[PDB]
Amino acid sequence: GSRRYDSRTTIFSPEGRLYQVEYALESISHAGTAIGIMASDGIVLAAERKVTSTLLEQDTSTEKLYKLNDKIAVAVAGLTADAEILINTARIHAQNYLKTYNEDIPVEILVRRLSDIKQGYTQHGGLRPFGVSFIYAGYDDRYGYQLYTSNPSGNYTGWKAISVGANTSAAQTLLQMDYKDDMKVDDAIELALKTLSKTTDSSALTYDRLEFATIRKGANDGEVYQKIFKPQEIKDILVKTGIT
Amino acid sequence: DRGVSTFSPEGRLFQVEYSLEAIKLGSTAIGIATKEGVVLGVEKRATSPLLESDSIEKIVEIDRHIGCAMSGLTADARSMIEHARTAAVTHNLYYDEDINVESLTQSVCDLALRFGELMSRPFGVALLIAGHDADDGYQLFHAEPSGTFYRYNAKAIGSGSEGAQAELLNEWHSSLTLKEAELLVLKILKQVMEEKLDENNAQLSCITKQDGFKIYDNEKTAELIKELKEKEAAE
Amino acid sequence: MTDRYSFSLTTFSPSGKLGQIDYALTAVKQGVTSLGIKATNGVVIATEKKSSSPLAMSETLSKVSLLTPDIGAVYSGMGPDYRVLVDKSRKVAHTSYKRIYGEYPPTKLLVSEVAKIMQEATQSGGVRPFGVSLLIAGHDEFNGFSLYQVDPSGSYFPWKATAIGKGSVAAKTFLEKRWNDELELEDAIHIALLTLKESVEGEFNGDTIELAIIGDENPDLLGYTGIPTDKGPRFRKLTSQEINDRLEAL
Amino acid sequence: MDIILGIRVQDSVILASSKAVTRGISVLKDSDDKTRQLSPHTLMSFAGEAGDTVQFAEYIQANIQLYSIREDYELSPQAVSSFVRQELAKSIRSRRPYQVNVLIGGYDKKKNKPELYQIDYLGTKVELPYGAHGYSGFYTFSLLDHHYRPDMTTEEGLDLLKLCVQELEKRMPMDFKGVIVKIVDKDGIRQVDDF
Amino acid sequence: GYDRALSIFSPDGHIFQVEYALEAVKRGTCAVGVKGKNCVVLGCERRSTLKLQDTRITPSKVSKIDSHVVLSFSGLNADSRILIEKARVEAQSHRLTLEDPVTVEYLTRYVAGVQQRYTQSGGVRPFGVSTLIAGFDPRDDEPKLYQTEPSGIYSSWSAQTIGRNSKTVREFLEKNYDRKEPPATVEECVKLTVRSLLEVVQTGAKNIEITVVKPDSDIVALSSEEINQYVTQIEQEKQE
Amino acid sequence: NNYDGDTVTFSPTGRLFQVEYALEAIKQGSVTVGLRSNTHAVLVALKRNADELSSYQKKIIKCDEHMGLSLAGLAPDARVLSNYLRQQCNYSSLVFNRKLAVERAGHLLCDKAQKNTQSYGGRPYGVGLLIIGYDKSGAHLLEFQPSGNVTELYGTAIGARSQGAKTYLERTLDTFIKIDGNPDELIKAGVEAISQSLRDESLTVDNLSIAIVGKDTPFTIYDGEAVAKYI
Amino acid sequence: GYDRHITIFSPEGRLYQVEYAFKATNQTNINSLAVRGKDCTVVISQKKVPDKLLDPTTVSYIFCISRTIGMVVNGPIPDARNAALRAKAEAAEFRYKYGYDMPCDVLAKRMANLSQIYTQRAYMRPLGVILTFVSVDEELGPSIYKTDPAGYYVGYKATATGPKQQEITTNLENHFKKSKIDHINEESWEKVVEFAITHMIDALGTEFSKNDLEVGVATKDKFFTLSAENIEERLVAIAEQ
Amino acid sequence: TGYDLSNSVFSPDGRNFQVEYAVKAVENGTTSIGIKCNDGVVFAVEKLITSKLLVPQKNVKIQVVDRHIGCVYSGLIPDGRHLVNRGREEAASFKKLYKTPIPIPAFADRLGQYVQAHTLYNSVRPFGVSTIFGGVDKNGAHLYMLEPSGSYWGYKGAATGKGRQSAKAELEKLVDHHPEGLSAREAVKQAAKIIYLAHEDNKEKDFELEISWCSLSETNGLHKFVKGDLLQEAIDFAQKEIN
Numbered sequence A: 001g002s003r004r005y006d007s008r009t010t011i012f013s014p015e016g017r018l019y020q021v022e023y024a025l026e027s028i029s030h031a032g033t034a035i036g037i038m039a040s041d042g043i044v045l046a047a048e049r050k051v052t053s054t055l056l057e058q059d060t061s062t063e064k065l066y067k068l069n070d071k072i073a074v075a076v077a078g079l080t081a082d083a084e085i086l087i088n089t090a091r092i093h094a095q096n097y098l099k100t101y102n103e104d105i106p107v108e109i110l111v112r113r114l115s116d117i118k119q120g121y122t123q124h125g126g127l128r129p130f131g132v133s134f135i136y137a138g139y140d141d142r143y144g145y146q147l148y149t150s151n152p153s154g155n156y157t158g159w160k161a162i163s164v165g166a167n168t169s170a171a172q173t174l175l176q177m178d179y180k181d182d183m184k185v186d187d188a189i190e191l192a193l194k195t196l197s198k199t200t201d202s203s204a205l206t207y208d209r210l211e212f213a214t215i216r217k218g219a220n221d222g223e224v225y226q227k228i229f230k231p232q233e234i235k236d237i238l239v240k241t242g243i244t
Numbered sequence B: 001d002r003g004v005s006t007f008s009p010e011g012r013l014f015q016v017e018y019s020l021e022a023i024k025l026g027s028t029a030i031g032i033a034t035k036e037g038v039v040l041g042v043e044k045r046a047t048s049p050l051l052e053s054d055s056i057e058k059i060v061e062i063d064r065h066i067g068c069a070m071s072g073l074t075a076d077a078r079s080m081i082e083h084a085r086t087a088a089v090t091h092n093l094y095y096d097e098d099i100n101v102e103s104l105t106q107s108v109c110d111l112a113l114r115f116g117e118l119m120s121r122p123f124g125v126a127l128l129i130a131g132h133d134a135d136d137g138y139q140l141f142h143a144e145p146s147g148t149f150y151r152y153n154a155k156a157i158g159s160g161s162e163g164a165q166a167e168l169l170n171e172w173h174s175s176l177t178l179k180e181a182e183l184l185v186l187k188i189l190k191q192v193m194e195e196k197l198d199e200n201n202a203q204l205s206c207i208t209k210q211d212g213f214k215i216y217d218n219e220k221t222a223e224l225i226k227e228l229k230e231k232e233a234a235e
Numbered sequence C: 001m002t003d004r005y006s007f008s009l010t011t012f013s014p015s016g017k018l019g020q021i022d023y024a025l026t027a028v029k030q031g032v033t034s035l036g037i038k039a040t041n042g043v044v045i046a047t048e049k050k051s052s053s054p055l056a057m058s059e060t061l062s063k064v065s066l067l068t069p070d071i072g073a074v075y076s077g078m079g080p081d082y083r084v085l086v087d088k089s090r091k092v093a094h095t096s097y098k099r100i101y102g103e104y105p106p107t108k109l110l111v112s113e114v115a116k117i118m119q120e121a122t123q124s125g126g127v128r129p130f131g132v133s134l135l136i137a138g139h140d141e142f143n144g145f146s147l148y149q150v151d152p153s154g155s156y157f158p159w160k161a162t163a164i165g166k167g168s169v170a171a172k173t174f175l176e177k178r179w180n181d182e183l184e185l186e187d188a189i190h191i192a193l194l195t196l197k198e199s200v201e202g203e204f205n206g207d208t209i210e211l212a213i214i215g216d217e218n219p220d221l222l223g224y225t226g227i228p229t230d231k232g233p234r235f236r237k238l239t240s241q242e243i244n245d246r247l248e249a250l
Numbered sequence D: 001m002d003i004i005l006g007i008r009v010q011d012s013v014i015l016a017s018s019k020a021v022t023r024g025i026s027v028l029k030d031s032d033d034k035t036r037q038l039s040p041h042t043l044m045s046f047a048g049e050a051g052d053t054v055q056f057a058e059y060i061q062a063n064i065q066l067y068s069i070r071e072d073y074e075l076s077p078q079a080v081s082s083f084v085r086q087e088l089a090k091s092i093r094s095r096r097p098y099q100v101n102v103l104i105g106g107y108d109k110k111k112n113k114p115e116l117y118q119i120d121y122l123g124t125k126v127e128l129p130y131g132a133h134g135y136s137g138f139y140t141f142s143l144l145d146h147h148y149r150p151d152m153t154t155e156e157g158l159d160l161l162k163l164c165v166q167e168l169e170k171r172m173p174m175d176f177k178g179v180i181v182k183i184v185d186k187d188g189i190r191q192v193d194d195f
Numbered sequence E: 001g002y003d004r005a006l007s008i009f010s011p012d013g014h015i016f017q018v019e020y021a022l023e024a025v026k027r028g029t030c031a032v033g034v035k036g037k038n039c040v041v042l043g044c045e046r047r048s049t050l051k052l053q054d055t056r057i058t059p060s061k062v063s064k065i066d067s068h069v070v071l072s073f074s075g076l077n078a079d080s081r082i083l084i085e086k087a088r089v090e091a092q093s094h095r096l097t098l099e100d101p102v103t104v105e106y107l108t109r110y111v112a113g114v115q116q117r118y119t120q121s122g123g124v125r126p127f128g129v130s131t132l133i134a135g136f137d138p139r140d141d142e143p144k145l146y147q148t149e150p151s152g153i154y155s156s157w158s159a160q161t162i163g164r165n166s167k168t169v170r171e172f173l174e175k176n177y178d179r180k181e182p183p184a185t186v187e188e189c190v191k192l193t194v195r196s197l198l199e200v201v202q203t204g205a206k207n208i209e210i211t212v213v214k215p216d217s218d219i220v221a222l223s224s225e226e227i228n229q230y231v232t233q234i235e236q237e238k239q240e
Numbered sequence F: 001n002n003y004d005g006d007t008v009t010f011s012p013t014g015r016l017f018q019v020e021y022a023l024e025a026i027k028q029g030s031v032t033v034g035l036r037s038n039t040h041a042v043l044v045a046l047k048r049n050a051d052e053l054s055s056y057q058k059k060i061i062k063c064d065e066h067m068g069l070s071l072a073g074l075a076p077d078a079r080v081l082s083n084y085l086r087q088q089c090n091y092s093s094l095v096f097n098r099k100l101a102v103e104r105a106g107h108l109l110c111d112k113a114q115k116n117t118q119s120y121g122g123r124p125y126g127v128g129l130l131i132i133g134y135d136k137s138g139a140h141l142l143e144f145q146p147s148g149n150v151t152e153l154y155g156t157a158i159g160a161r162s163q164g165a166k167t168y169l170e171r172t173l174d175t176f177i178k179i180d181g182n183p184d185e186l187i188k189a190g191v192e193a194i195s196q197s198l199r200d201e202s203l204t205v206d207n208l209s210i211a212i213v214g215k216d217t218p219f220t221i222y223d224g225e226a227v228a229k230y231i
Numbered sequence G: 001g002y003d004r005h006i007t008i009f010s011p012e013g014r015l016y017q018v019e020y021a022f023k024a025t026n027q028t029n030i031n032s033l034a035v036r037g038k039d040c041t042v043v044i045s046q047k048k049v050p051d052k053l054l055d056p057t058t059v060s061y062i063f064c065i066s067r068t069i070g071m072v073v074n075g076p077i078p079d080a081r082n083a084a085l086r087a088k089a090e091a092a093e094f095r096y097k098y099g100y101d102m103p104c105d106v107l108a109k110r111m112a113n114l115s116q117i118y119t120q121r122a123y124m125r126p127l128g129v130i131l132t133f134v135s136v137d138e139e140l141g142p143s144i145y146k147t148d149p150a151g152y153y154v155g156y157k158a159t160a161t162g163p164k165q166q167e168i169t170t171n172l173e174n175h176f177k178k179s180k181i182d183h184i185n186e187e188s189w190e191k192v193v194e195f196a197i198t199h200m201i202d203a204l205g206t207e208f209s210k211n212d213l214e215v216g217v218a219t220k221d222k223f224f225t226l227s228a229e230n231i232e233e234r235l236v237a238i239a240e241q
Numbered sequence H: 001t002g003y004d005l006s007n008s009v010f011s012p013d014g015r016n017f018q019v020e021y022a023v024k025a026v027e028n029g030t031t032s033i034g035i036k037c038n039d040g041v042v043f044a045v046e047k048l049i050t051s052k053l054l055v056p057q058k059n060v061k062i063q064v065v066d067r068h069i070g071c072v073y074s075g076l077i078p079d080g081r082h083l084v085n086r087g088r089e090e091a092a093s094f095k096k097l098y099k100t101p102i103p104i105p106a107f108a109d110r111l112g113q114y115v116q117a118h119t120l121y122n123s124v125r126p127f128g129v130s131t132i133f134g135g136v137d138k139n140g141a142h143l144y145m146l147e148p149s150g151s152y153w154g155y156k157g158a159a160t161g162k163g164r165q166s167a168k169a170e171l172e173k174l175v176d177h178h179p180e181g182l183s184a185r186e187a188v189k190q191a192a193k194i195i196y197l198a199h200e201d202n203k204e205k206d207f208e209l210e211i212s213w214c215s216l217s218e219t220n221g222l223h224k225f226v227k228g229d230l231l232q233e234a235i236d237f238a239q240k241e242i243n
């Protein structure tokens, strides 16, 4: 029968590892680097695009940074199509919570839900896991500014600064060196771009290669603003920090 | 790989035969039937001295007139016990009477071969089901994961079983008293156990018509162990 | 008489590769060349009509397909896989959009829906991925003209111009030299015909080439008059004669 | 179940609920507490069809207590009231709807404000300075329209509530056997034992 | 649906998927449980490979199942959430129908039953998790500490450890824990728990988490500075 | 070899190995004999024990007042198949007020066994059955094999060493068929037939199991001191 | 090498089960041909009855799908009949739902889409057949549309299928290169059948008796197969000029 | 290699080896035949007497479908019964909806499509029988033979099982020597002879002859078993021809 052709995607190895999760993480290690840095007055999300071509329409393009609601955004590392399945589920969960309680979803609750979906694909159903790691950047009135990551295992953890995708070992050493707790958004912007500038496999870091975003509580009269940077605005912040 | 319900060339189900190997690795359980009652005893086998041994529940009540001892993957027994209890109570609800020991055993054994590609594998545990009813009197049954059950005058299961069974072969007779059967279970358990037998690492129980199924106190079993030591030293 | 293939047939290998997706991309590489170029006032998509026999009527086989009145699609790879995707793409444009909002979806969202269907064939039980890459050109009121590529993984990217299939590496280089942000639609058609001539071996004419545009509204192709807001389809497939006219000024 | 009242004052919410349980000809009980604590700073009173009332109240209680353990956090009164409303709005188009009307009195610890929500069996939610379900409101709303001020103390709120109960004891046909009164404030929920 | 028998017997009578789940537990960070005369303490390891963490918002290792019962674990973190959620739901369901909170033994028996079910159900793998479940029964002052594992067996322990290098800390506890006279106070019990973790942890106070559970729903988590005082006192006595 | 992993696979010579392996489980089972005359039909079964402390495994199962079987192989599979026969006998009675024909009972067992040999996931039944009965066309004896093949016979035997009893019956055919209106002599012939399959062990009081059905005789099972007469 | 057993991609981007289904197509060792007239569409196929014990009237690979649509199959008869029954059901259902007769090209598309599903879904095998659909369509006129185990389909001016398809194909190609038209310029279907048989004789290099051929003819509003005696009349006319 | 391990897999030839392996089970079985006559059909089968203990005339192999169709098969006997059970359901639903009894060509395709369906998936095994069947309908007599692949054709004479070559040779002589046709009573006699001649391939164990027939004149177009004097007359004719 059909048993012959079953890869068995949800089993332990003799060492007690999940084969498919480990191999999915190997896939993610080749994806473009994404960095999240959390400051006292905001969060930065910076990410490197993978497909440099002069003919790619950049201003209408979105492979890395996605909006989940007005308060929460994600940076993607891995298969973009897999990520969009999960993103649309997370957008729905947020609106279900808003409909039920008449309050915006707390960041951790959204993260846990997505992380539980990923977990399920490793324990039952016989399907391959999602080849995606997320950096979640968000704000709520309980914990304020929060950074999380999740990976194909369905495990999630909180961070002051973090990287996913390619060259994370190198990236995390550089962040651990220059990060301080009293840091601000403008300084964190500079740190994010400098870290990508050194870890990048490309010859030079340019505006056409980056997706950039900030979550500030520096809107008019104590609200929170999500800014997804336009190409010209990424070009300006590259000149300002002194990279180009 | 290969089917879960596959026959071997000798005409045996692979998974059933492999579950019998799991049962050999389990702790020893012994049952002896008499005209005064049926005795059930087990080796507890704590993995460490910090483990509170009284929480090791390898002897279990099914109804007032039916007790049960287990050996093998003891976690698998919980759903079998749950089914046995429900079957016993349900039959009392439908018929206003105690359920026969054989019928209860048969109901448990009907679960056994419900596996395939229903549950994904056979049970990895054998049961000694002991009880009393008005029709066939005091009875002891051995329920396997094959779906087969045999009645026994006496039976040992688990790691020391073949050694214990040969000893039960010589010692059992139709005129055994209940007191004699208690000592005989303690004797044979002490023989096959790795660690030295005492009230904390071994447990006795019985089922009589008058008092029903009773798990023995550690203080009561301790006296029977002391009585055993003296009678063996006596010759 | 059971579907027992409830498990994934695409899995991660030790190196992190999804083998079936890579192999699907290889099938796309073997397929005939197709391209897309975006102008200021339009978009063009084009491909070769590789006829399997001269007895076969190549007019009946449509490689360039209307999805909505303002959106068109072309492919490289396995033709039957493309055909069923066009059927599903047309239907999902109605079910998940037009029957809700009373208007056709914008290009990017229809692309997103097609992408979703292709992703699911990359993860669901008992199926292989689609062996095609699509080029989807379209127009909508708020985004303007656009051109998208969709791969077997479900991933999609917006392009100013690109090519896929057989001679895509050479064709993409040719387009990099010729493309600028001030191109008119006629200039983009001219560049499309020049680019496509390089990858074609045999005959090169209106009968062996399939080309369509997303351009101005065509009220003459609408089929009715009396509603000022309905101005006609922006999708138009160029005729055999219309292609040959432009090949003389080539 | 007959009379449930609620009044929101300066720094607290007071709920008053009748003690009688009557089946047909006989008053079976005269000490029934028609309320459940949903969280430490949120109390729900209820009235409606026999059986449905308690089943619904305990079901909501279980769900809010589950949320509290999972997040190690107390939902705001507004959030609890929206959850309750959705459950009732779902219920009304079921095979057999919950015939239960509720008042939710809570103290929001974030905003430092008392809040009173009135929700009927259809899922009709309103936030109010004072509320009532059933025939009670026909007598008590006019009173409260006259005597209520937003800056009243808890003691003034209790006196205003005595004036409501006296009016109901004078003019309503059913003997509702007095009321159990409970206060919800910054310090939690407590029962006024003498009323 | 995906029906494939993943947990099956092998010729030697072993279920490899269950045994390989125990290896996932062996990999997990160390967790320890010690019960005193009038308390239970749950100690947990935090691996210091992960710095630049946010300790406010990171999932804590000890989880409240109800106001009177706690659950810690060793193994796969994602798997543990599924057991914790099911246990939390069952705790409220028990209150709803029995009008009484769960006993610690009952909650353990439920979690253990879920773990067992995943060893003989089609299309699923076992949980790569062992748990320590601790607390006090309602209106009872006797301390309770139980352990569960992927197979579904459970049992009661005077003291117990699970996870990486649990062999070493179990060795320590077997010689240092006296049954005739357990840790009489909260101080004595926390000290013995920290001492036992200091055998394996090989770092100061950031890598140790302590949670004290007392009768009548009195659960509190110790801070870094409070734990660091125990670490200081243990090593100063050791220098002799 | 490569073609014995499941029941859905033919071998290159057109064989179904899983079915043949199930057939092997019957040969390992204890011996049981069936025979009949024109008036009565008899089952004789050698029951097997685990050891001296154990009971002897029951071999004979009653299906209706006029029909029953003896088993050899996996006993739980005999329980499943006998339960199915009990239900089909019962359906015939409740719906049509009709005792189920023994020939039709065989056809139903055949078709039930067959479905397990053609579909994936399932396994063949691991047991052989001897069905006796008395219906509107007189006494009947059937042999069931879990391949699906069911055969009507004057006499037969199945299990370990069953060839000995089967040869005896092949010689005795002309004698025992004529034993009409004499149940004790027909049982004697069955007990003498099963004796040809014995080695080392002999027929004791709790070893032997006999059943009979006939003209004015319901299906009744004899065990214990009830069979001491025939030893 | 389980990528050769089920319909998943090999490293080369190939589906081996589809390719092997194409080889099953020629198992019968039969050649078919289809051409278009002015008013008609003719399909001819070789008929081989090796066993004397066979009833020759029941041996056929031409099927009447609907009143207007005929289908000839190249491939084994079980798969041919599977395809025939489904096409009949699909044609009838189409008429019921949409109120007009299913066009030849639309039925071809539908059957091709079904074939595509078997190349993408693992539990279903491809059918080892090539299906040549013929009609005189009320909109498009004389029509030939052909489907294969890949789920490919296309319209044809004329076509051929079988072991010696290339020899027949080139013969037909060369005729249409001379005439410079997409069809057989002939009024009666009888003469179009005579053309079809003649050009198969030339291409295969074999003579035919009445029992060696099988013929199907589509006209406006009906498709029908010829009897042995109707074919004999055709063979006599070919020989006499 | 590995192409023969799973049903519905094409080999590089374009063959389904599992179906070809099912044919080997058919070739292993006893001989069964069919003869088309003037106004009907005759079926006959070889039943091997494994033992004296087999009750004569009791283990009936030929099966009726509806009241007008006869079915006989060689190979795995239970697989044949499963196919006839389905055939009976197909004939019943046809008669339920359309009133008229199922025509023989219609019935042939119902079996054909069902057998063919068991070559489409790896979750099922092909049928291990070749089935000879037929009867009388409104358009006259029809004889068919159906293989494990689902393949079937109409026949003047048909044969399958271990003695098929011997039988096929004898049937071919009848077709040549009787072009105007064979009578129903003649076909019964000839069917007996052919089974007796085909028994030389299974000559170790003695056998039992079983015949059935449908004929417009002799049975009113209904399926009946040949019994008593007419059976013995056919046995005597067969015994005379071998000697």
Ligand SMILES: [Cl-]
Residues within 6 Å of the ligand: G109, G110, G113, G114
């Ligand atoms: Cl379709």
